[PDB]
Amino acid sequence: SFEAIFGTYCNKIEWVTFLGTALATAAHAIMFHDLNKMTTGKMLFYIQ
Amino acid sequence: SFEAIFGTYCNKIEWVTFLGTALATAAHAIMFHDLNKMTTGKMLFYIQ
């Protein structure tokens, strides 16, 4: 008598990146490296 | 630390004219440079 362990079937997971998704169309993703120095980034708009 | 003002973004308003609009098809618009001297203005209609 015996047991017959069959194969360890590893699941390989789908890899997702931010830019491959369509939430990147809602974003404007920028790498900025001195961001741990900036407090609050200000956009100024000039509306006539 | 810093404050990080981003770029100033100016509005450019859609420059309309009177004749691009559809009010101009209700209009028969005429310049008359001596119009300030109009006391009145009239149109006589003779109807058979």
Side-chain angles (χ1 to χ4, degrees), chain B:
Chain B
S1 67
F2 54 85
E3 194 171 2
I5 304 165
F6 297 105
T8 66
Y9 291 148
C10 67
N11 191 0
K12 188 181 290 182
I13 187 61
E14 180 180 1
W15 306 102
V16 304
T17 184
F18 180 77
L19 295 177
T21 66
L23 279 75
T25 201
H28 186 268
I30 303 163
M31 284 176 72
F32 170 58
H33 296 87
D34 288 328
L35 199 147
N36 53 0
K37 305 170 180 67
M38 282 188 176
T39 299
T40 65
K42 70 176 70 62
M43 286 181 178
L44 275 76
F45 301 98
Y46 181 73
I47 302 167
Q48 296 174 356

Short mmCIF file of all heavy atoms in Angstrom, two decimals, chain B:
data_model
loop_
_atom_site.label_atom_id
_atom_site.label_comp_id
_atom_site.label_asym_id
_atom_site.label_seq_id
_atom_site.Cartn_x
_atom_site.Cartn_y
_atom_site.Cartn_z
N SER B 1 14.00 71.79 3.39
CA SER B 1 12.61 71.67 2.96
C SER B 1 12.32 72.80 2.00
O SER B 1 12.98 73.84 2.02
CB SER B 1 11.65 71.74 4.14
OG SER B 1 11.67 73.03 4.72
N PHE B 2 11.30 72.60 1.16
CA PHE B 2 10.86 73.67 0.27
C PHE B 2 9.37 73.55 0.01
O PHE B 2 8.69 72.66 0.53
CB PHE B 2 11.67 73.70 -1.03
CG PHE B 2 11.73 72.41 -1.77
CD1 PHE B 2 10.72 72.06 -2.66
CD2 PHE B 2 12.80 71.55 -1.60
CE1 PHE B 2 10.80 70.88 -3.37
CE2 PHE B 2 12.87 70.37 -2.30
CZ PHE B 2 11.86 70.03 -3.18
N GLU B 3 8.87 74.47 -0.82
CA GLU B 3 7.45 74.69 -1.00
C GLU B 3 6.91 74.23 -2.35
O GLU B 3 5.74 73.88 -2.44
CB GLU B 3 7.14 76.18 -0.79
CG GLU B 3 5.68 76.54 -0.62
CD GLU B 3 5.49 77.99 -0.21
OE1 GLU B 3 6.50 78.72 -0.10
OE2 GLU B 3 4.34 78.41 0.03
N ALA B 4 7.75 74.23 -3.39
CA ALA B 4 7.50 73.57 -4.68
C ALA B 4 6.28 74.13 -5.42
O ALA B 4 5.29 73.44 -5.65
CB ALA B 4 7.38 72.05 -4.51
N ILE B 5 6.37 75.40 -5.79
CA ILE B 5 5.42 76.02 -6.71
C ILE B 5 5.59 75.42 -8.09
O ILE B 5 6.69 75.46 -8.68
CB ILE B 5 5.65 77.54 -6.76
CG1 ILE B 5 5.56 78.14 -5.36
CG2 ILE B 5 4.65 78.18 -7.70
CD1 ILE B 5 6.10 79.54 -5.25
N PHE B 6 4.52 74.87 -8.64
CA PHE B 6 4.57 74.35 -10.00
C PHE B 6 4.16 75.47 -10.96
O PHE B 6 3.98 76.62 -10.56
CB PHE B 6 3.72 73.09 -10.13
CG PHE B 6 4.21 71.95 -9.28
CD1 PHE B 6 3.54 71.60 -8.12
CD2 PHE B 6 5.33 71.23 -9.64
CE1 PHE B 6 3.98 70.56 -7.34
CE2 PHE B 6 5.78 70.19 -8.85
CZ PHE B 6 5.10 69.85 -7.70
N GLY B 7 4.03 75.14 -12.24
CA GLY B 7 3.99 76.17 -13.27
C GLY B 7 2.66 76.92 -13.30
O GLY B 7 1.59 76.35 -13.08
N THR B 8 2.75 78.22 -13.58
CA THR B 8 1.56 79.05 -13.69
C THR B 8 0.85 78.76 -15.00
O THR B 8 1.48 78.70 -16.06
CB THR B 8 1.93 80.53 -13.62
OG1 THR B 8 2.71 80.88 -14.77
CG2 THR B 8 2.73 80.81 -12.37
N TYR B 9 -0.47 78.58 -14.94
CA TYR B 9 -1.27 78.07 -16.05
C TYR B 9 -2.36 79.08 -16.39
O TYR B 9 -3.33 79.22 -15.64
CB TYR B 9 -1.85 76.72 -15.68
CG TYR B 9 -0.80 75.63 -15.58
CD1 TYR B 9 -0.94 74.59 -14.69
CD2 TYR B 9 0.36 75.70 -16.33
CE1 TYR B 9 0.02 73.61 -14.58
CE2 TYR B 9 1.33 74.72 -16.23
CZ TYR B 9 1.15 73.68 -15.35
OH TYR B 9 2.12 72.71 -15.25
N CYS B 10 -2.20 79.78 -17.51
CA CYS B 10 -3.07 80.90 -17.83
C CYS B 10 -4.27 80.44 -18.65
O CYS B 10 -4.16 79.56 -19.50
CB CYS B 10 -2.32 82.00 -18.58
SG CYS B 10 -1.75 81.55 -20.22
N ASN B 11 -5.42 81.05 -18.37
CA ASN B 11 -6.62 80.82 -19.15
C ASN B 11 -6.60 81.68 -20.40
O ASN B 11 -6.15 82.83 -20.38
CB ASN B 11 -7.86 81.14 -18.31
CG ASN B 11 -9.15 80.67 -18.95
OD1 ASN B 11 -9.16 80.08 -20.03
ND2 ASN B 11 -10.26 80.93 -18.27
N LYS B 12 -7.09 81.11 -21.50
CA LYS B 12 -7.21 81.83 -22.77
C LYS B 12 -8.66 81.74 -23.19
O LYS B 12 -9.12 80.68 -23.64
CB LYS B 12 -6.29 81.24 -23.82
CG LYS B 12 -6.21 82.05 -25.10
CD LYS B 12 -5.30 81.36 -26.08
CE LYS B 12 -3.85 81.42 -25.63
NZ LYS B 12 -2.94 80.80 -26.62
N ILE B 13 -9.38 82.84 -23.06
CA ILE B 13 -10.83 82.82 -23.25
C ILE B 13 -11.15 82.79 -24.74
O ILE B 13 -10.46 83.40 -25.56
CB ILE B 13 -11.48 84.01 -22.52
CG1 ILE B 13 -13.00 83.90 -22.56
CG2 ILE B 13 -10.96 85.35 -23.02
CD1 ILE B 13 -13.52 82.65 -21.88
N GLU B 14 -12.17 82.00 -25.09
CA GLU B 14 -12.62 81.85 -26.47
C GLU B 14 -13.13 83.17 -27.01
O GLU B 14 -14.19 83.64 -26.60
CB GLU B 14 -13.71 80.79 -26.57
CG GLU B 14 -14.23 80.59 -27.98
CD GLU B 14 -15.32 79.54 -28.06
OE1 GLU B 14 -15.70 79.00 -27.00
OE2 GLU B 14 -15.81 79.27 -29.18
N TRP B 15 -12.38 83.76 -27.94
CA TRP B 15 -12.69 85.10 -28.43
C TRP B 15 -13.86 84.97 -29.40
O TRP B 15 -13.69 84.54 -30.53
CB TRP B 15 -11.48 85.71 -29.12
CG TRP B 15 -10.27 85.71 -28.25
CD1 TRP B 15 -9.22 84.85 -28.31
CD2 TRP B 15 -10.02 86.58 -27.14
NE1 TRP B 15 -8.31 85.15 -27.33
CE2 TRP B 15 -8.78 86.21 -26.59
CE3 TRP B 15 -10.71 87.65 -26.57
CZ2 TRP B 15 -8.22 86.86 -25.51
CZ3 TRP B 15 -10.16 88.29 -25.50
CH2 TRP B 15 -8.92 87.90 -24.98
N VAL B 16 -15.04 85.33 -28.95
CA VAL B 16 -16.20 85.24 -29.81
C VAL B 16 -16.35 86.55 -30.56
O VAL B 16 -15.84 87.60 -30.16
CB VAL B 16 -17.49 84.91 -29.02
CG1 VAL B 16 -17.31 83.62 -28.25
CG2 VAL B 16 -17.88 86.05 -28.12
N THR B 17 -17.03 86.48 -31.69
CA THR B 17 -17.48 87.65 -32.42
C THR B 17 -18.97 87.52 -32.63
O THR B 17 -19.57 86.47 -32.39
CB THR B 17 -16.76 87.79 -33.77
OG1 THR B 17 -17.18 89.01 -34.40
CG2 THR B 17 -17.09 86.62 -34.67
N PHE B 18 -19.58 88.62 -33.06
CA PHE B 18 -21.02 88.63 -33.25
C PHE B 18 -21.42 87.79 -34.45
O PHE B 18 -22.52 87.22 -34.47
CB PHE B 18 -21.50 90.06 -33.42
CG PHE B 18 -22.97 90.17 -33.64
CD1 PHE B 18 -23.85 90.04 -32.59
CD2 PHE B 18 -23.49 90.41 -34.90
CE1 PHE B 18 -25.20 90.13 -32.78
CE2 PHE B 18 -24.83 90.50 -35.10
CZ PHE B 18 -25.69 90.36 -34.04
N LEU B 19 -20.57 87.69 -35.46
CA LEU B 19 -20.98 87.07 -36.71
C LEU B 19 -20.70 85.58 -36.76
O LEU B 19 -21.23 84.91 -37.64
CB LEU B 19 -20.30 87.76 -37.89
CG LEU B 19 -20.76 89.20 -38.05
CD1 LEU B 19 -20.01 89.87 -39.18
CD2 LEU B 19 -22.25 89.29 -38.27
N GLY B 20 -19.89 85.06 -35.85
CA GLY B 20 -19.74 83.62 -35.77
C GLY B 20 -20.95 82.95 -35.17
O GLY B 20 -21.26 81.80 -35.51
N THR B 21 -21.67 83.65 -34.30
CA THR B 21 -22.81 83.09 -33.60
C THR B 21 -24.01 82.99 -34.52
O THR B 21 -24.04 83.56 -35.62
CB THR B 21 -23.17 83.95 -32.40
OG1 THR B 21 -23.63 85.22 -32.85
CG2 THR B 21 -21.95 84.15 -31.53
N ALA B 22 -25.02 82.26 -34.07
CA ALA B 22 -26.24 82.14 -34.86
C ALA B 22 -27.18 83.32 -34.68
O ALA B 22 -28.16 83.41 -35.42
CB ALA B 22 -26.97 80.84 -34.52
N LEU B 23 -26.90 84.23 -33.74
CA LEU B 23 -27.66 85.47 -33.68
C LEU B 23 -27.45 86.30 -34.93
O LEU B 23 -28.33 87.05 -35.35
CB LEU B 23 -27.27 86.29 -32.44
CG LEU B 23 -27.85 85.97 -31.06
CD1 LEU B 23 -27.24 84.74 -30.46
CD2 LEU B 23 -27.64 87.13 -30.13
N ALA B 24 -26.29 86.13 -35.57
CA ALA B 24 -26.01 86.78 -36.83
C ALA B 24 -26.92 86.31 -37.95
O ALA B 24 -27.09 87.05 -38.93
CB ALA B 24 -24.56 86.54 -37.22
N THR B 25 -27.50 85.12 -37.87
CA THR B 25 -28.48 84.82 -38.91
C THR B 25 -29.83 85.42 -38.60
O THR B 25 -30.64 85.55 -39.51
CB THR B 25 -28.61 83.32 -39.18
OG1 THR B 25 -29.17 83.14 -40.48
CG2 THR B 25 -29.55 82.66 -38.23
N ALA B 26 -30.07 85.84 -37.37
CA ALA B 26 -31.20 86.72 -37.12
C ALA B 26 -30.86 88.18 -37.37
O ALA B 26 -31.76 89.02 -37.35
CB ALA B 26 -31.70 86.56 -35.68
N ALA B 27 -29.60 88.49 -37.61
CA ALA B 27 -29.15 89.87 -37.74
C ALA B 27 -28.87 90.22 -39.20
O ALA B 27 -28.33 89.41 -39.95
CB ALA B 27 -27.89 90.11 -36.93
N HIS B 28 -29.26 91.44 -39.57
CA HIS B 28 -28.74 92.10 -40.76
C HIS B 28 -27.90 93.27 -40.25
O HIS B 28 -28.37 94.40 -40.18
CB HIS B 28 -29.86 92.52 -41.66
CG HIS B 28 -29.41 93.08 -42.97
ND1 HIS B 28 -29.20 94.43 -43.17
CD2 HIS B 28 -29.10 92.47 -44.13
CE1 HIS B 28 -28.79 94.63 -44.41
NE2 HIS B 28 -28.72 93.46 -45.02
N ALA B 29 -26.65 92.98 -39.90
CA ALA B 29 -25.83 93.90 -39.12
C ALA B 29 -25.07 94.84 -40.04
O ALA B 29 -24.36 94.40 -40.95
CB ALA B 29 -24.86 93.12 -38.23
N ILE B 30 -25.21 96.14 -39.79
CA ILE B 30 -24.64 97.18 -40.64
C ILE B 30 -23.90 98.18 -39.76
O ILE B 30 -24.47 98.69 -38.79
CB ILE B 30 -25.73 97.91 -41.44
CG1 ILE B 30 -26.55 96.95 -42.29
CG2 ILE B 30 -25.12 98.97 -42.33
CD1 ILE B 30 -27.83 97.55 -42.74
N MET B 31 -22.65 98.45 -40.10
CA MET B 31 -21.96 99.60 -39.53
C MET B 31 -22.35 100.87 -40.26
O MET B 31 -22.52 100.88 -41.48
CB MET B 31 -20.44 99.43 -39.60
CG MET B 31 -19.91 98.47 -38.57
SD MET B 31 -18.14 98.16 -38.71
CE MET B 31 -17.48 99.71 -38.12
N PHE B 32 -22.50 101.93 -39.48
CA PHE B 32 -22.76 103.27 -39.98
C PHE B 32 -22.05 104.22 -39.04
O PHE B 32 -22.47 104.38 -37.89
CB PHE B 32 -24.26 103.54 -40.06
CG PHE B 32 -24.59 104.95 -40.33
CD1 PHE B 32 -24.11 105.58 -41.45
CD2 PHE B 32 -25.42 105.63 -39.49
CE1 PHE B 32 -24.42 106.89 -41.69
CE2 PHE B 32 -25.74 106.94 -39.73
CZ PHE B 32 -25.25 107.57 -40.83
N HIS B 33 -20.98 104.85 -39.53
CA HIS B 33 -20.05 105.53 -38.65
C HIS B 33 -20.58 106.86 -38.13
O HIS B 33 -20.02 107.39 -37.16
CB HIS B 33 -18.72 105.74 -39.38
CG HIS B 33 -18.04 104.45 -39.73
ND1 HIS B 33 -18.30 103.77 -40.89
CD2 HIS B 33 -17.12 103.72 -39.06
CE1 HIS B 33 -17.56 102.67 -40.93
NE2 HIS B 33 -16.84 102.62 -39.83
N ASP B 34 -21.63 107.40 -38.73
CA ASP B 34 -22.25 108.63 -38.26
C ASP B 34 -23.57 108.36 -37.54
O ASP B 34 -24.52 109.12 -37.66
CB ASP B 34 -22.46 109.59 -39.43
CG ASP B 34 -21.15 110.19 -39.93
OD1 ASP B 34 -20.23 110.37 -39.11
OD2 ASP B 34 -21.04 110.45 -41.14
N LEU B 35 -23.63 107.26 -36.78
CA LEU B 35 -24.88 106.82 -36.20
C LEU B 35 -25.26 107.61 -34.97
O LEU B 35 -26.45 107.67 -34.63
CB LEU B 35 -24.80 105.33 -35.85
CG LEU B 35 -26.06 104.50 -35.62
CD1 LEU B 35 -25.75 103.12 -36.10
CD2 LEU B 35 -26.47 104.44 -34.16
N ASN B 36 -24.29 108.23 -34.30
CA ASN B 36 -24.54 109.00 -33.09
C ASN B 36 -25.45 110.19 -33.33
O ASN B 36 -26.10 110.66 -32.39
CB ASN B 36 -23.22 109.45 -32.50
CG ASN B 36 -22.34 110.19 -33.50
OD1 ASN B 36 -22.72 110.37 -34.66
ND2 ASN B 36 -21.17 110.62 -33.05
N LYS B 37 -25.53 110.68 -34.56
CA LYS B 37 -26.39 111.79 -34.94
C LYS B 37 -27.79 111.33 -35.35
O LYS B 37 -28.58 112.17 -35.79
CB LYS B 37 -25.75 112.56 -36.09
CG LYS B 37 -24.35 113.02 -35.77
CD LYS B 37 -23.66 113.55 -37.01
CE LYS B 37 -22.26 114.02 -36.69
NZ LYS B 37 -21.39 112.87 -36.30
N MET B 38 -28.09 110.04 -35.25
CA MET B 38 -29.46 109.60 -35.49
C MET B 38 -30.34 110.04 -34.34
O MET B 38 -30.21 109.53 -33.22
CB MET B 38 -29.55 108.09 -35.66
CG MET B 38 -29.13 107.60 -37.01
SD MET B 38 -29.45 105.85 -37.26
CE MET B 38 -28.94 105.69 -38.96
N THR B 39 -31.23 110.99 -34.61
CA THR B 39 -32.32 111.24 -33.68
C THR B 39 -33.23 110.03 -33.60
O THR B 39 -33.41 109.44 -32.53
CB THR B 39 -33.11 112.47 -34.12
OG1 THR B 39 -32.25 113.62 -34.13
CG2 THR B 39 -34.26 112.72 -33.17
N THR B 40 -33.79 109.63 -34.73
CA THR B 40 -34.56 108.39 -34.83
C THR B 40 -34.03 107.55 -35.97
O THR B 40 -32.93 107.77 -36.48
CB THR B 40 -36.05 108.65 -35.06
OG1 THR B 40 -36.23 109.28 -36.34
CG2 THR B 40 -36.64 109.53 -33.98
N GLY B 41 -34.82 106.55 -36.36
CA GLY B 41 -34.65 105.85 -37.61
C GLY B 41 -35.97 105.20 -37.92
O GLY B 41 -36.64 104.74 -36.99
N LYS B 42 -36.40 105.15 -39.17
CA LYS B 42 -37.70 104.56 -39.44
C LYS B 42 -37.70 103.83 -40.77
O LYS B 42 -36.79 103.95 -41.58
CB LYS B 42 -38.81 105.60 -39.45
CG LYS B 42 -38.74 106.52 -40.63
CD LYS B 42 -39.91 107.45 -40.64
CE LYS B 42 -39.80 108.44 -39.53
NZ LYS B 42 -38.58 109.22 -39.75
N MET B 43 -38.77 103.06 -40.98
CA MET B 43 -39.03 102.39 -42.25
C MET B 43 -40.49 102.57 -42.59
O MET B 43 -41.36 102.14 -41.84
CB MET B 43 -38.70 100.90 -42.18
CG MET B 43 -37.23 100.54 -42.17
SD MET B 43 -37.11 98.75 -42.11
CE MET B 43 -35.35 98.50 -42.15
N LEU B 44 -40.77 103.22 -43.72
CA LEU B 44 -42.12 103.28 -44.23
C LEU B 44 -42.42 102.06 -45.07
O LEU B 44 -41.60 101.64 -45.90
CB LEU B 44 -42.35 104.54 -45.07
CG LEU B 44 -42.74 105.85 -44.40
CD1 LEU B 44 -41.56 106.49 -43.74
CD2 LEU B 44 -43.35 106.78 -45.43
N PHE B 45 -43.60 101.50 -44.88
CA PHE B 45 -44.07 100.36 -45.66
C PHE B 45 -45.34 100.77 -46.37
O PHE B 45 -46.28 101.25 -45.73
CB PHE B 45 -44.31 99.16 -44.77
CG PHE B 45 -43.09 98.72 -44.02
CD1 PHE B 45 -42.90 99.11 -42.72
CD2 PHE B 45 -42.14 97.94 -44.64
CE1 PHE B 45 -41.78 98.71 -42.03
CE2 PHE B 45 -41.02 97.54 -43.96
CZ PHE B 45 -40.83 97.93 -42.65
N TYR B 46 -45.36 100.58 -47.68
CA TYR B 46 -46.52 100.88 -48.51
C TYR B 46 -47.12 99.56 -48.95
O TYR B 46 -46.50 98.82 -49.72
CB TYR B 46 -46.13 101.73 -49.71
CG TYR B 46 -47.31 102.08 -50.56
CD1 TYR B 46 -48.24 103.01 -50.12
CD2 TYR B 46 -47.51 101.48 -51.79
CE1 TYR B 46 -49.33 103.33 -50.88
CE2 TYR B 46 -48.61 101.80 -52.56
CZ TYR B 46 -49.51 102.72 -52.10
OH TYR B 46 -50.61 103.05 -52.85
N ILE B 47 -48.31 99.25 -48.46
CA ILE B 47 -48.92 97.95 -48.67
C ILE B 47 -50.09 98.12 -49.62
O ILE B 47 -51.09 98.76 -49.28
CB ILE B 47 -49.37 97.33 -47.34
CG1 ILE B 47 -48.18 97.20 -46.40
CG2 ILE B 47 -49.97 95.97 -47.59
CD1 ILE B 47 -48.58 96.90 -44.99
N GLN B 48 -49.96 97.56 -50.81
CA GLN B 48 -51.12 97.39 -51.68
C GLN B 48 -52.02 96.33 -51.08
O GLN B 48 -51.55 95.36 -50.48
CB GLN B 48 -50.67 96.99 -53.08
CG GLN B 48 -49.84 98.05 -53.78
CD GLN B 48 -49.29 97.60 -55.11
OE1 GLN B 48 -49.45 96.44 -55.50
NE2 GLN B 48 -48.61 98.50 -55.81
#
